[PDB]
Amino acid sequence: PDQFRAIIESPEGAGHVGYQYRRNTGSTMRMVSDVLDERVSLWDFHCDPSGNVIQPGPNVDSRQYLQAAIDYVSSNGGGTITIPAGYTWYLGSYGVGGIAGHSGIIQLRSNVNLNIEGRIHLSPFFDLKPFQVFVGFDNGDPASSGNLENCHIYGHGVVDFGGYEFGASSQLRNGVAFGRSYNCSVTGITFQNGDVTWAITLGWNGYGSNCYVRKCRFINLVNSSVNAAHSTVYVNCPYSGVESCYFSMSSSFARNIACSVQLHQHDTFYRGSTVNGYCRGAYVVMHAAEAAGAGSYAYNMQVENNIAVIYGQFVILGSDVTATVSGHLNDVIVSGNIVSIGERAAFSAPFGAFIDIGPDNSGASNVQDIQRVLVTGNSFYAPANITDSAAITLRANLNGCTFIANNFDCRYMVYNAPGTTSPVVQNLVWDKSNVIGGTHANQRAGQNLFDMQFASVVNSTIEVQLSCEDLSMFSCILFPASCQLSYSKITVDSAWTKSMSNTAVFEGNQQAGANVYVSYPATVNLTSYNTQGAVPFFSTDTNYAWVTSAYSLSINENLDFSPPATYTNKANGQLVGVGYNEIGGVRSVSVRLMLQRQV
Amino acid sequence: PDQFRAIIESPEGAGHVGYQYRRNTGSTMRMVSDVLDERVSLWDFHCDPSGNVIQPGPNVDSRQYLQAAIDYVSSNGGGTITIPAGYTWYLGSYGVGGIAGHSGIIQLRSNVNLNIEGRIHLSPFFDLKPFQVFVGFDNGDPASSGNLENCHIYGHGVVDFGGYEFGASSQLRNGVAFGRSYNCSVTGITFQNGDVTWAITLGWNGYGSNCYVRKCRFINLVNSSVNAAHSTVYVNCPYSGVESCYFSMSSSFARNIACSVQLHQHDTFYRGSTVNGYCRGAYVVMHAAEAAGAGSYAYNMQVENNIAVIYGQFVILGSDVTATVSGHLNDVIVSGNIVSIGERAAFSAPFGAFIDIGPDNSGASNVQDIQRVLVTGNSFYAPANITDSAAITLRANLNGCTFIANNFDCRYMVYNAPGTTSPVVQNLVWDKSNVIGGTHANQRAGQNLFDMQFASVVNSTIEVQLSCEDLSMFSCILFPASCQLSYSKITVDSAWTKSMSNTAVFEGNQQAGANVYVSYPATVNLTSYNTQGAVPFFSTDTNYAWVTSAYSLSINENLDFSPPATYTNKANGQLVGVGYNEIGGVRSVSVRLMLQRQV
Amino acid sequence: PDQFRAIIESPEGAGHVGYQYRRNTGSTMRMVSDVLDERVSLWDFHCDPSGNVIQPGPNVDSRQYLQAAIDYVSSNGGGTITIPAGYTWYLGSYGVGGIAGHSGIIQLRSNVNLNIEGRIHLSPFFDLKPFQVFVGFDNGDPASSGNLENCHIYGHGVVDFGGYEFGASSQLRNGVAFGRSYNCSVTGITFQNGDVTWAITLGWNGYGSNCYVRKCRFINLVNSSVNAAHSTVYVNCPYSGVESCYFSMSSSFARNIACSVQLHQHDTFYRGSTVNGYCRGAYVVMHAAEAAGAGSYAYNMQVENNIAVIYGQFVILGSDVTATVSGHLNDVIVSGNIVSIGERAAFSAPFGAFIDIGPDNSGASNVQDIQRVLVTGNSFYAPANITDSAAITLRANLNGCTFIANNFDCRYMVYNAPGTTSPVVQNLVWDKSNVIGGTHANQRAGQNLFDMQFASVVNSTIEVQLSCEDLSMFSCILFPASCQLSYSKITVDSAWTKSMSNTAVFEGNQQAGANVYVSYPATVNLTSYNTQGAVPFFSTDTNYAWVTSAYSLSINENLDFSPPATYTNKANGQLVGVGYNEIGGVRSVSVRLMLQRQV
Numbered sequence A, B, C: 001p002d003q004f005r006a007i008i009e010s011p012e013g014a015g016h017v018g019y020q021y022r023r024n025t026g027s028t029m030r031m032v033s034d035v036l037d038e039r040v041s042l043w044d045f046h047c048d049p050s051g052n053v054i055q056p057g058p059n060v061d062s063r064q065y066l067q068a069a070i071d072y073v074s075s076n077g078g079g080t081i082t083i084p085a086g087y088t089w090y091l092g093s094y095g096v097g098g099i100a101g102h103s104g105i106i107q108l109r110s111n112v113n114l115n116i117e118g119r120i121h122l123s124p125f126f127d128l129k130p131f132q133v134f135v136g137f138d139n140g141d142p143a144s145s146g147n148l149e150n151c152h153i154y155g156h157g158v159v160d161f162g163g164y165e166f167g168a169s170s171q172l173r174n175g176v177a178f179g180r181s182y183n184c185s186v187t188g189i190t191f192q193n194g195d196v197t198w199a200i201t202l203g204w205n206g207y208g209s210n211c212y213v214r215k216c217r218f219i220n221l222v223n224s225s226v227n228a229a230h231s232t233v234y235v236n237c238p239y240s241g242v243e244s245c246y247f248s249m250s251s252s253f254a255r256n257i258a259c260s261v262q263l264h265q266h267d268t269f270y271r272g273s274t275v276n277g278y279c280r281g282a283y284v285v286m287h288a289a290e291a292a293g294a295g296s297y298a299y300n301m302q303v304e305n306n307i308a309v310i311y312g313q314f315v316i317l318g319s320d321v322t323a324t325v326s327g328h329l330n331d332v333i334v335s336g337n338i339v340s341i342g343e344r345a346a347f348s349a350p351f352g353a354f355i356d357i358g359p360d361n362s363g364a365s366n367v368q369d370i371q372r373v374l375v376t377g378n379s380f381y382a383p384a385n386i387t388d389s390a391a392i393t394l395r396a397n398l399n400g401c402t403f404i405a406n407n408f409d410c411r412y413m414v415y416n417a418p419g420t421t422s423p424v425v426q427n428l429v430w431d432k433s434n435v436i437g438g439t440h441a442n443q444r445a446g447q448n449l450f451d452m453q454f455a456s457v458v459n460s461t462i463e464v465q466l467s468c469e470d471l472s473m474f475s476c477i478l479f480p481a482s483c484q485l486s487y488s489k490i491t492v493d494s495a496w497t498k499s500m501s502n503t504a505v506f507e508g509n510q511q512a513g514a515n516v517y518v519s520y521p522a523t524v525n526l527t528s529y530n531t532q533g534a535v536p537f538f539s540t541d542t543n544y545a546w547v548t549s550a551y552s553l554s555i556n557e558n559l560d561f562s563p564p565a566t567y568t569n570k571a572n573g574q575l576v577g578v579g580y581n582e583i584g585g586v587r588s589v590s591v592r593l594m595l596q597r598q599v
């Protein structure tokens, strides 16, 4: 009786108060404590050594308490710990043990989920230091680490990095480092107010599977000149991806260093997301140095249905090698994306591009094996002043990329800087269904719309179609003499080209190759013989030995004669056709022709 | 001891019964009340003045109780209130204070989420009156309103509008009016059984951000002739959108007045949703009157991967101006959508269209600044009887829209009514990869497939490709004499056109323009000179002064001669070519030619 | 007093301990039991007849307990039962009553959700037997069954089928059979480790609506040679679909029998999912035998944005009939998908295909009514050795399918086996914007790239464009003499074709048809007359009576003469053109021409 009151007030009290669900006689006869034990919060571990609850706040380091919670729930086979709403929970010290090597704060454990409803903040203890807030590795050496399985972080809560700048460029900072992560995810969470390297990394060098980031927000996560590099979500295990997320940056430095996503393993995706204020959209890459878990091929890579305002490149393709491993990148789709380069001065940020074929980290452009890429049904726009804007900047070797039914409205279509790298290009396909916008009309003095600054081009198709005039451009397409061109199809539709002095330019007369198939407009001067009746007209110049046929693109203002409608050539390089002199006389005309070779 | 039993039975009783999670000695020593206080439901506020719980039902007005709950949780920094399953919670009176000006029932507050698992119903108090069920404004004047932040409504529950008709057309009704809403969302909820203006509105005149509607259902939300207008989700803040929702209407009135979504600010989206029984799919618009929060440009607008059966127009583009602000709409993508016009009589609902370039609310067609729109990889179908069906109805000024790789199977491709508006059109691009269906073959007597009823057309491309015969149509493309045409490309592929008497029709002979690039089939009568050997053939008519070349589309049934394969023209407007008379004689033939001008 | 202590320890004890939320004086004065009654778990029913809790495990059959829970919550109008984390809950017996006819384990009930956080496992009682784990029918006869409404299964938990093989091929096994299911869903759940027919079926013969599978995983669900057939999610009610799911199989048998999804009713979708190790991606079909609930038309079918590695066919289209009902399939979109055939020997699995137009279950190919299908912006790849790989295998009647802006890199573009079925084909549209890959170059000896093994082809378009050479192929396109061809457009672009001896082959000279529009390259020998000056050249062969024009694709190596640039024909089937002899003499040349008919 005295004993009873004592028991009731003790910590075992709830385990003595009976309960039966809804007074149902067929329900289990339980105690209150059993029902309360069905859920678990940080409050259940956020206490002093005497078991008195501690209130969180800027002067309380909640880390040991949250770790105690995770450790305990782990011991029972898992569950979900709530981080309660209405409170900010500060982290103020590093974790210990296997996450120490990763500058870990909290260690995640398998089957233990975190429902983050309140706020998690970093205390100024972390100012100018490295940190990785949640770490899923159990060993300082990732290679000796066990796995993290079935760990989900979700809720309406917030992870706030406290605004602290990096102390040194060589430091790393992360939000969620899942590790060798299988069936792990982050959903609904806002990551904000920092200077970090990544917010979330999934997998470790290809180890992991079925990891996803969904409906999260990432806001202002780069803030200093010290930050070396930033990729908001790093996907480094297969069968994993990012969808329906929001990414925003406002610092100037983010415009030069920040990427929203990097996809590094096969069967990965980046979809339905919105990006603003970033340098880059996504890197899609097989790095040989990360091929341990899932092989040396990145394939089945999808970037789709995203909205972006960026300052540099939207999708960056790459692959590289080590002494013992070669990376390969193939079977990629980039579709449905609507992307623009934000308002900025020309050359004030990394060169603007929808697609970039980038060299490796050390700058090499002769190691890449990138092929079977499909770029379709995207829109891209860059303001008229941004000289450094291209549909594709093709700066390293390329083994194939196909463009169909895009709308590109920027300065260049295909570009590479001259006197830089000399890529070897195979299987570049630019279908006639790509629409070329007019924003940059009149801005292109001295410039080639397709500036083919390559070592060589093979098995490629460029079908140029203009949709408005731009008489400022030097040419629609130009190949320098140093670029070999073979087994290719290069065509310039004549619409909007009547006043262009150059349409297609082959500085090494590469269009004469045996398996080169071309057509483009040119102006040609012809002279006829004096014969009345059917009469030959011949070109005054002799540079047409490669031409298989040509046809008139000009009206005939004359009554007394007509030039040929169509022409062939002669061994000396003249064109020759048969027109008609109603009355005799030598004729001399200047005609716009469509020159054709094997087409 | 007497005291103890008394305390235990009192409302402080649970705060005297000890608990320690799973009997863990390292866990907090708490009381039962602490653990129960981790969650909160409507039951905790749904009581009389003496604190006795009240059962909800049709004769209980739950509004003050739910408001008390929201107000209180707000006071503690937020949390989630559950609306319990297994009950219907009726609302029976208006709210008071700052939501009174919005005919508000409940006021939402920042960080207070609603987990709606049961049903929320409106009582007949609201019959024939305005209402807005949940309101996030805190002031009758939205301009003087504070913000709503971090408010999420979610669950498997239902909001039921009680079926009440509108009392008067000028009334407004809404479900969730979030207000100046930042990081607010609605997920999983069914909205049903009403006559409202909107179900959900996000933002206020551009104020707001990161607001989303996901996996909701909207069922039968228009039911009367009184309802002036309906848009189910109104997106009026940037970085916000609708995805994976279901929209259905069954009333006849919805076919004439209801739109599923309106996107009114930049960086907004409408994706992966299914629509049935609506007039319209989405309005995508910059209204100058709503440009306060986020600027006067709507850009980065995405409508993708939706399934719709509608009765009017799928996507409606617009922009307008006020005395001091001009709205602009650019950088839009419409892709992957599969849309049909439901079974209906011709002209029985608003004119059927995949894309509509609509005039402003007052009807003006000369204020719009719409450009950089990409319409790609969509399907559209309208039944054969629906005369009023078009890929695009282009009824107001247009500064650009690009169509690539769509499949359109309806009556018209491009349409505008004659004797209505006379749009000024720039940069309309209709790529040859648009496939034109055959459902309406034989229905097109008196009709032009592309009926270009415009003031002018510039920098436009129409590349017509048929995929089956339709000899009923008057022409594939017709320009009236009142339409100026310049710096454009207009082509009709010859497949399926051999028996057409008109292919392309330029009623003002606009194809003669200096920067007009055209080609289309025509039948031409020619006569030759009598000369044996190479011999000229000339057209009997003189209307070909604009033709730069022509070539045969007919076989030659003759042995003793052949007409020219190719033709040019003469100053008098004749065509002229060189054929061959094996035997002499004047020849007279009627040949199908491809007429070409600068192409 | 003695009484009080007794009451407190009894099962009514919690109903005597007072509580008021957060000590708020305006809150309801409740008892602890009321707050605990807001939630419900399996623990509340998992007890013996004396009400003592039973621990789950391999030797406890949890089925009756979970059924008791569902039944009870159903009685109160619904709610959500948690299946707790940290435990495995074994099922060990069949259910009773209306689910007995479906070999049901558990009966789902309306408004009763399951939050599965722990694991549900099948005990060896089910080895070699049929089962359907969760069943939503309430009657052994589905036709006499009531509906299941508002039933959601969700959580981070697992359903594990115990690895048991099927006992006999005629057995059926399912995970979730929702029945006549309205507003039902499964979200987040992993289904693994079995040999089943389906994991989830939605609807019953068209009865149902708004059923969805989202963010689930399906892993290793076929494991034996006994299994007759497998479709992981079967969508058999309208306004329903699958999105963001993961499907994986590892058994060899799955490569031959398993499909990820089947869509069987209108307004259904399959999006954003990843598939590996399956035979097939999706069946998209109207089966007449299932047209009871939602009509005999499957329309508004969407397969989009999926990633797949399969061994057979990606999307299979079909429709069939019964004695009284005819099924129709129309208005389908397949877009944005990136698909490959996995590494395998040629012919070692069902024939590889992006699209398959399949015969019915009994093998008939003359019952299908499939039209208005759009296949756009997809990628497909098959390794070079896989002879049995096609963009489309067209094996049954087809009333229309449109391909635009795909990238297909496999052995065939269009294929049907000769000496099999003889489909009747209408409205097959293959736009020039389809890019044909080069992986299979040099592998095509004896093969036609487009092998048109049909009864007939009408109102079809094939526009062949190569992007690299493949001189191994017999032809780019071949029609056998048995295939009628009319009102069609067939073109072969000349790029990469200069060395091909056959480009287009019409074994029945079908290109001569009145409404056939063709063009393709050919080599032609010509001889001229001896006349100096304008001089005719004529073909030595007479097989060109169908040719309307031809033009040179070869250079002229000669100085003293030129052949015609362009040719027409003569009644005897010769070609004839006018060239020029600078000096007289009979000329004899062999020229590559583009032959054109009505184009």
Ligand code: NA
Pocket: A371, A372, A373, A374, A400, A401, A402, C407
């Ligand atoms: Na490709």
Ligand code: NA
Pocket: A454, A455, A456, A482, A483, A484
């Ligand atoms: Na070179």
Ligand code: NA
Pocket: A407, B371, B372, B373, B374, B400, B401, B402
């Ligand atoms: Na555009």
Ligand code: NA
Pocket: B454, B455, B456, B482, B483, B484
């Ligand atoms: Na005019």
Ligand code: NA
Pocket: B407, C371, C372, C373, C374, C400, C401, C402
């Ligand atoms: Na179609």
Ligand code: NA
Pocket: C454, C455, C456, C482, C483, C484
């Ligand atoms: Na036949």
